Amino acid sequence: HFTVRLTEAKPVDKVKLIKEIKSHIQGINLVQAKKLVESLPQEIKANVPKAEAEKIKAALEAVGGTVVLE
Amino acid sequence: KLKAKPLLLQLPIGEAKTFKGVVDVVMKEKLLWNCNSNDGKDFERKPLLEMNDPELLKETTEARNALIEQVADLDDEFADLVLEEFSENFDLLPA
């Protein structure tokens, strides 16, 4: 499996990043998501399959996010 | 079965012949009605009984948190504002 990491959050995509994080995690809250997005570098998900990792990284970079995979 | 996400803004006091008042969510107040015609000509505003009913307070603040979460997940600009200023407050602003 792969792991995803959010490196930096854009100043102008700050608004759009949180909604995507909320829709992707499905188990996090608003303020927890904000802390996750302000505490970069910080992991988002781990042990994610390849196709799901590709989809989430594409959706996170299409809204202005710096996404890396390890 | 209507396929539309609702936004609760008011909590009734009772259900079966004991519905005598409502509790607003955005304003954090309670409205009472004790009369036959016009129910006192107005609604009686005594916000959450002046910090005296812990159960009512907890229910009202949980409803406010749920409403804020819903509106922030729906609208993006409001999500940005909650992100930027009132995250840990959970009490953004009255109205």
Swiss-Prot record, chain B:
Widely expressed. Transmembrane segments: none annotated. It comes from the Eukaryota. It is found in: Mitochondrion. This protein may be expected to contain an N-terminal transit peptide but none has been predicted. Belongs to the TRAFAC class translation factor GTPase superfamily. Classic translation factor GTPase family. EF-G/EF-2 subfamily. Mitochondrial GTPase that mediates the disassembly of ribosomes from messenger RNA at the termination of mitochondrial protein biosynthesis. Acts in collaboration with MRRF. Promotes mitochondrial ribosome recycling by dissolution of intersubunit contacts. GTP hydrolysis follows the ribosome disassembly and probably occurs on the ribosome large subunit. Not involved in the GTP-dependent ribosomal translocation step during translation elongation. It is linked to Combined oxidative phosphorylation deficiency 39: An autosomal recessive disorder due to mitochondrial dysfunction and characterized by global developmental delay, axial hypotonia, dystonia, dysarthria, impaired intellectual development with poor speech, and deficiencies of the mitochondrial respiratory chain enzyme complexes. Neuroimaging shows abnormalities in the putamen and caudate nuclei, along with subcortical white matter involvement. This is Ribosome-releasing factor 2, mitochondrial. It comes from Homo sapiens.
